Ligand binder design. Structure first.
Ligand SMILES: *[C@@H]1O[C@H](CO)[C@@H](O[C@@H]2O[C@H](CO)[C@@H](O[C@@H]3O[C@H](CO)[C@@H](O)[C@H](O[C@H]4O[C@H](CO)[C@@H](O)[C@H](O)[C@@H]4O[C@H]4O[C@H](CO)[C@@H](O)[C@H](O)[C@@H]4O)[C@@H]3O)[C@H](O)[C@H]2NC(C)=O)[C@H](O)[C@H]1NC(C)=O
Ligand SMILES: *[C@@H]1O[C@H](CO)[C@@H](O[C@@H]2O[C@H](CO)[C@@H](O[C@@H]3O[C@H](CO)[C@@H](O)[C@H](O[C@H]4O[C@H](CO)[C@@H](O)[C@H](O)[C@@H]4O[C@H]4O[C@H](CO)[C@@H](O)[C@H](O)[C@@H]4O)[C@@H]3O)[C@H](O)[C@H]2NC(C)=O)[C@H](O)[C@H]1NC(C)=O
Ligand SMILES: *[C@@H]1O[C@H](CO)[C@@H](O[C@@H]2O[C@H](CO)[C@@H](O[C@@H]3O[C@H](CO)[C@@H](O)[C@H](O[C@H]4O[C@H](CO)[C@@H](O)[C@H](O)[C@@H]4O[C@H]4O[C@H](CO)[C@@H](O)[C@H](O)[C@@H]4O)[C@@H]3O)[C@H](O)[C@H]2NC(C)=O)[C@H](O)[C@H]1NC(C)=O
Ligand SMILES: Cc1nnc(-c2cccc(-c3cccc(C(=O)N4CCCCC4)c3)c2)o1
Ligand SMILES: Cc1nnc(-c2cccc(-c3cccc(C(=O)N4CCCCC4)c3)c2)o1
Ligand SMILES: *[C@@H]1O[C@H](CO)[C@@H](O)[C@H](O)[C@H]1NC(C)=O
Ligand SMILES: *[C@@H]1O[C@H](CO)[C@@H](O)[C@H](O)[C@H]1NC(C)=O
Ligand SMILES: *[C@@H]1O[C@H](CO)[C@@H](O)[C@H](O)[C@H]1NC(C)=O
Ligand SMILES: *[C@@H]1O[C@H](CO)[C@@H](O)[C@H](O)[C@H]1NC(C)=O
Ligand SMILES: *[C@@H]1O[C@H](CO)[C@@H](O)[C@H](O)[C@H]1NC(C)=O
Ligand SMILES: *[C@@H]1O[C@H](CO)[C@@H](O)[C@H](O)[C@H]1NC(C)=O
Ligand SMILES: *[C@@H]1O[C@H](CO)[C@@H](O)[C@H](O)[C@H]1NC(C)=O
Lengths: 352, 124, 95, 124, 352, 95, 124, 352, 95
């Protein structure tokens, strides 16, 4: 009847890890050149029982490594001719053009660690996940950088999922993951060699697909705001990299007017430009001017970065933080460690 | 595999019962280079931690053991629950979380007890 | 609150600060919770404010934890209080 | 190497004598990638089985041991032979084969004995 | 004087294993193509003491794996143009010719297992082997398929060894392993392009070698049947793949009349044919017709599959079970596991 | 024993069976232990029997454990008993 | 790492103190293919020697232990020094070198003592 | 108060090892061909505390392995046309010329062993080193063979270090390691095709560098012999391989008159010769005659092998033992093993 | 010591020996400690002795542990004692 302290070894109790993951992945392309020495060949090839875990995508740490490895890749591979760091410091580089087409990479746990995965389709957010499994490696993610539309990512399993740390507040973004992709075809045709045009381009979006998609999004948004009509608007202002929709294909820096999407095919007017701001930190960079021949991007719109007005309701596109883009894919994973030692009350005593 | 008994997902009581059964059955007998090496590195680390822990536990008088009974009484202020409430309804994760802030106190006491007993025995 | 109230036709500058110097994302808002100006990624982001065509910042100072907000062509009608939502703090200042 | 004493090919008595001698001497101190990895995989498995077995044996009160003496008497019906007949003339293979069908009975008894002793000790 | 039960760990007691072995082995040839991904590079490089073990070649299990791996190799590599499975189901395939020349492969034990080998030259059979050693890998075996004569296998160390589960009964075959090989040269010369000949071929066997070999075989057979004259005969009937001697070189399916061997060089008349029965199971297959140019096989007769008449004595060639062919090489090996735990009576007691 | 005895000029069929459906090798023999018909590998093998030129089977049934034996142009002189040496069993049937 | 306590470079007394502290902290929780394989081969060997030694030491009654106390008295002729002179001022290397020629004598005595005790216990 | 015997495991006590080290290292060149199968790829990448160790370069054993591996390399790679072993035995070989340019190799410890390194710049000799660290692998050493001058080796960190087992005795050599290298350029120019010249060559040594170097050496030698003027002399006699300075580049065997160095640039007269004595053991060998085109060696004089007169003092160059050359680089390393078990007096007793 | 003393105009041979047969390096010296003749590596090395132009050895015997020393055109003025510093021994012989 006397209660005593006893100790057990092999107790399966988890704590969050602070470790570093390794990269695994699969012709001079810069990501392939990098991967050649940066990543290992991939793994050629476990649901847990009645467990619950509080995954929190906005407070994760897998993100910092992803957002350090990509800057290193990018900065080494895409050299500006002029790079200005703020006094100021200006350096220059040789500027050959390079092939640029992002490839998937996987993050994998080092010895002693494992990655928890949330398998709940109706993920919702930072609340408890009641469907948890374990892996060594995450699925492959293409480190695509873009601003208003999230391109070439994964799709929601069944329904559009709106994930936001605080929907009500509006000082935070809303990440919308689509359960369907919308195809977009962007190109700069030949016979556009004028100086006053090599910097002009256009994009085609299926009219029906876009309209079907927004109707589905609105039906989901109305759950939070059931008494209001939802109106989409264009951007408010600020740096051009985020005012309009920016992306990069073939090494060229593209900007597109998305007003017609948030106001046959829908045609957007796009431009290519030599002077850009950096996303790597505060500063500017100049890249060598465009080349001749037809240029084309082919992509899947898989999501949106939206914000909502404060004080009928209005939403508009925005973005600029590559970390937000990384979260949209890494939200399902957490890395943990095991501390195999515990204490419990018992009903025995040591002979003394 | 540090989770020798596989208790994540079930309560502690069930885990102990499962061990007894499995131990009985076991005694009774009832890219390919890269991942090849990584698979072993993981096992070697786990072995080393295991062997290490088994002797570190001698500080509390529990070396060479998976389960070790004490001479330090439970302080009810650390839980105020019965044996069956804890062993039948809680998982190890729930349990350690419940008492997460008394760990250093308890470990300290276990060391102290072991020291006193060693002293007493050498005095004779 | 802190008060830095100017007059119609002026230019004013307010500084919000961070203690960790992480170029933390932040947003400047009025009492009606309208986003005016903030730090999104490494970029300057504006909201649908009456100040959208007048306000600016100092990007190079974000690395020092300094997030100044400059309003050019200030009107007395812009008199309000605003919040520096930088890190944990929610400092209120009148302009 | 699970055959720690190397007894296949010799009788049990000789194996025990050999151990004593070798243990004394030891204490006293008296393609290349593919097969490289396979050679280690084999050792890692053997280590894991060893460590596992050493604690599984606690069910009979014999953990952390190579050799463990009991409180369960031998039932002559299982052999009807003397100690020297068995230890001097039979190899381990011959011996286990001779008593191959009493194994579960014996293991059961060993578990029972251990349970009863643990019970008796905690009662005090 | 009181006898007690005691337990020892590390007890070297063997049990037969039920595990799966891996393949190791050494230009588009089908076996090399297969081996490229199916087998590992071979091992660049132990007699036991006074032990005895009952090896049983007719009850082994290494055979099933060999006879699963070869079917998989073969079926993937030698595509029939028409394959009929019995109702019936008929499928077709593209039929390029392929190079076909069997190479040796080795079977090797996985972690936790070892292979016992019998080193007794006078092996005899399923009785106890008094000469036992251990290996990880077997010697290499070429998976040659043939019917009446066993080709390109190993030779007996000293004397012809006759191995049969039950010699007396005759419902079982007799596998004869020679201690000498007899060379056979089979070919289809050029300038044989007639339609009514591309399907004709012949084989030469040294007269003396054949006659010397049979005299040696008979002297050994007479040990079982000392009062009878031994007469060899030709086949009795049944499927042509076994009535005559069948084999395959270069992908072509050859048939030879062995009557002159069981009735300068001895010349046999041979044919090449497009429609064959399968050895993989019950069914038929058509293969593309023969090609032009001289075709040659070069082989070592290393053994025979013989049967004996029931009710002077008569023997004849036969065969058809590739498992019998596999046994002729795998009879020396057994795979086992160790159960390092035992019980013995002792003369000590636990303090209680 | 089982008896299935026909007359001169008939055709008869006897079925031997296996319980495991493994297309097991088997051999059919007379009382003088002469191999008549069997399953060798996947092939039909005949022995030096008087039935060598008359007997047959059903190959597709071997996979179902059915090993029928068909004798065409049966003679009364073939009257004998025979054994189905299939698996463990040694069933005797008169034909 | 066989030098579990890291004593090369410091005296024995300090090493023992260091162990107590570190053990507490640990319990408390306070070319790439070639060298990859070689790094593991080294660890596997060390583990095997460790496990082996831990049971070999049973010959002196010290199996499953890092530290083991005896019933064999020290013969002053082997050193003629005090406990603090040795433990506070000498490193393990200096110490073993000082007594390098009495090793076999001592090991022999330890075996003998263990034998006698086992005999005495089984007599009861 | 009773003193007892106690035993500890994990006691860090060292003993010298007798093991074998493995080679690691980095176009048909003979050392590269050898290394391809003889050495592993190198390691892409620990000072001890208050420890002291008696390193003894003249009694080491790393040397024997180095002097077995090099003979094997050399003998396999540089075939004499005629090789005479003393009765006598004479064999011959094909004699293609080979590329010959020594590369660095590293010696590395096998599992269970480690190599101690002395980091004391003022190494001095066999006395105790008070600065000790551990490595798996040594630095790379080029197995250069030469007689009077030690070429292409390492330099002393600060000052010329004179290492000799017994300076006073003179039956032993003096190895002088320089803290500066002196460049020497040796060549056989084109347009030297005469028969009575293809075997003539010359070397240039900077006058100032040589003179500066000797002044520094003498200042150091005077520490041992402070009351005597030091005079350098030429060799005394004996086998030509050591009487003059011998070396090998490109496979050719060169001999140089060093008298002008021990008596703008200093020019030495050199010759190339076909019949040489062996350093591998007692015997002789003939190599194929010289080739056409300009031949050049480029090297760093890093040390000297000197001897001193017995009974003003005189020193002269000499050499001939490749083991002495090996010691000049291996003196910093020792290989040891750990015996993790010790005994100490204590103040506790076992309960009995 | 051992004495092997010849006369002016003679040729003499002395043999120094090793017990291990290792072709050990060795050096022959006079009483004034002048190196005369030795084994350096596999080569014959001479010292600055009056015997430098007269002495020789037998290289093929070094492998048998035999280190003979031959002095041609011996003078009585060379009468001295010499040391066989071979292995551990320092044998003294008069010539
Ligand atoms: C979303 O995912 C999709 C799928 O991964 C991404 O779409 C790919 O985008 C890349 C961008 O370059 C595009 O690559 C081109 O494919 C063409 C197919 O024939 C190639 O011909 C072309 O090569 C030429 O341009 C390269 C530019 O860097 C040169 O490096 C290369 O040498 C070639 O250059 C020749 O032609 C040019 C003509 O202007 C001439 O000036 C040169 O001198 C030379 O003659 C590229 O490889 C992929 O095909 C796209 N994939 C698909 C399926 O269409 C998409 O970009 C992702 N979205 C985002 C935003 O990343
Ligand atoms: C017992 O072991 C021995 C030794 O392993 C086996 O003997 C070998 O059998 C193979 C069977 O093909 C034989 O291979 C031929 O060797 C010739 C040597 O010069 C090759 O020239 C010939 O290549 C031609 O034929 C191939 C047929 O598949 C083609 O794939 C290949 O491209 C070549 O084809 C050219 O010539 C033909 C001429 O008819 C023409 O039609 C084509 O268009 C093309 O021009 C084969 O490689 C080995 O040489 C044999 N080994 C020896 C030592 O003789 C033996 O078969 C084993 N026994 C059994 C039953 O397996
Ligand atoms: C100290 O270290 C330095 C640095 O490692 C060593 O110096 C190197 O010594 C090698 C000796 O050969 C020398 O190699 C030559 O470099 C030349 C540079 O252009 C090459 O052209 C030359 O190649 C020719 O000669 C080779 C002789 O074996 C042939 O094998 C080869 O095929 C080439 O032969 C052509 O030219 C000859 C002309 O006579 C002609 O007969 C042939 O038919 C054919 O046409 C060698 O590679 C290195 O360059 C030296 N390094 C430097 C920096 O100069 C130095 O030797 C070390 N000291 C010692 C004593 O080892
Ligand atoms: C009751 C009871 N007592 N012991 C057990 C039990 C049941 C199953 C397994 C184990 C056990 C014990 C020690 C180790 C391991 C193990 O899995 N490894 C060794 C350490 C490194 C990883 C591999 C399992 C005990 O039930
Ligand atoms: C006091 C006191 N008691 N034990 C320790 C202590 C402190 C640190 C480490 C260890 C220890 C014990 C056993 C093993 C190991 C170890 O490092 N390995 C296991 C054997 C193979 C190499 C790895 C460490 C004990 O302090
Ligand atoms: C869903 O996300 C919102 C975001 O703030 C969070 O508050 C809520 O608790 C989440 N619910 C679940 C079940 O995860
Ligand atoms: C984009 O191009 C693909 C190419 O097959 C085409 O199928 C798709 O409909 C295009 N979409 C638009 C909107 O042009
Ligand atoms: C829509 O886009 C496709 C893409 O090629 C194009 O062919 C089609 O003509 C476009 N049609 C209209 C009406 O926009
Ligand atoms: C030899 O093989 C026969 C085959 O049945 C078997 O009966 C006999 O016992 C075997 N003898 C030995 C010694 O293996
Ligand atoms: C026997 O075969 C060889 C094989 O080439 C042939 O040359 C020889 O002529 C043949 N001789 C007879 C007589 O059959
Ligand atoms: C320096 O080397 C000489 C060579 O004999 C040796 O006697 C002396 O003790 C050494 N001194 C030190 C400090 O190593
Ligand atoms: C010294 O050597 C260099 C090497 O090329 C040569 O150019 C120079 O003329 C030489 N000078 C004298 C005076 O020896």
């Amino acid at each position: 009847a006397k209660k005593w302290v006893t100790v057990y070894y092999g107790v399966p109790v988890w704590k969050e890890a602070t470790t570093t993951l390794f990269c695994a992945s699969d012709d001079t392309e810069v990501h392939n050149v990098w991967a050649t020495h940066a990543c290992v060949p991939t793994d050629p090839n476990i649901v847990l029982g009645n467990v619950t875990e509080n995954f929190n995508m906005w407070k994760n740490n897998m993100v910092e490594q992803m957002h350090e490895d990509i800057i290193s890749l990018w900065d080494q591979s895409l050299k500006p001719c002029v790079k200005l760091t703020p006094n100021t410091s200006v350096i220059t580089q040789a500027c050959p053009k390079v092939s640029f087409e992002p490839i998937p990479i996987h993050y994998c746990a080092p010895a002693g660690f494992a990655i928890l995965k949330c398998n709940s389709k109706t993920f919702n957010g930072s609340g408890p996940c009641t469907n948890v499994s374990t892996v060594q490696c995450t699925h492959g993610i293409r480190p695509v950088v873009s601003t208003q539309l999230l391109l070439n990512g994964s799709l929601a399993e069944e329904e559009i999922v709106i994930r936001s740390e605080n929907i009500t507040d509006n000082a935070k973004t809303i990440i919308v993951q689509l359960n369907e992709a919308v195809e977009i075809n962007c190109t700069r045709p030949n016979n556009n060699t004028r100086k006053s045009n090599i910097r002009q381009a256009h994009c085609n979006i299926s009219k029906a697909r876009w309209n079907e998609t927004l109707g589905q999004i609105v039906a989901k948004l109305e759950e939070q705001f059931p008494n209001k009509t939802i109106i989409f608007n264009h951007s408010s202002g600020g740096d051009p990299e985020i005012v309009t929709h920016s992306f990069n294909c073939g090494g060229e820096f593209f900007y597109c007017n998305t007003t017609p999407l948030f106001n046959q095919n829908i045609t957007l007017q796009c431009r290519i430009k030599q002077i850009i701001n950096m996303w790597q930190g505060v500063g500017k960079a100049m890249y060598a001017p465009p080349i001749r021949g037809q240029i084309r991007c082919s992509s899947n719109i898989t999501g949106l970065l939206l914000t909502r007005d404060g004080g009928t309701e209005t939403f508009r596109p925005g973005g600029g933080n590559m970390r937000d883009n990384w979260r949209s894919e890494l939200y399902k994973y957490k890395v943990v460690k095991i501390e195999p030692l515990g204490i419990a009350p018992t009903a025995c005593k040591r002979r003394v | 595999i540090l989770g020798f008994l596989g208790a994540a997902g079930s309560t502690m009581g069930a885990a102990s019962m499962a061990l007894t059964v499995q131990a009985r059955l076991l005694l009774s007998g009832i890219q390919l280079t890269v991942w090849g090496i990584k698979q072993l590195q993981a096992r070697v680390l786990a072995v080393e931690r295991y062997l290490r822990d088994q002797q570190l536990l001698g500080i509390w008088g529990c070396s060479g053991k998976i389960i070790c009974c004490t001479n330090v009484p439970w302080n009810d202020s650390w839980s105020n629950k019965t044996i069956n409430e804890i062993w039948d309804n809680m998982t190890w994760m729930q349990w350690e979380k419940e008492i997460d802030n008394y760990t250093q106190h308890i470990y300290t006491l276990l060391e102290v007890s072991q020291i006193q007993q060693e002293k007493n025995e050498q005095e004779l | 609150k802190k008060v830095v109230l100017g007059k119609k036709g002026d230019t004013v500058e307010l500084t919000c600060t961070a203690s960790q110097k992480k170029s933390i994302q932040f947003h400047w808002k009025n009492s009606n919770q309208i986003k005016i100006l903030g730090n999104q990624g490494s970029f300057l982001t504006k909201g649908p404010s009456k100040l959208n065509d007048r306000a600016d910042s100092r990007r190079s100072l974000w690395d020092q934890g300094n997030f100044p907000l400059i309003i050019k062509n200030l009107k007395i009608e812009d008199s309000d209080t605003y919040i520096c939502e930088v890190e944990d703090q929610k400092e209120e200042v009148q302009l």
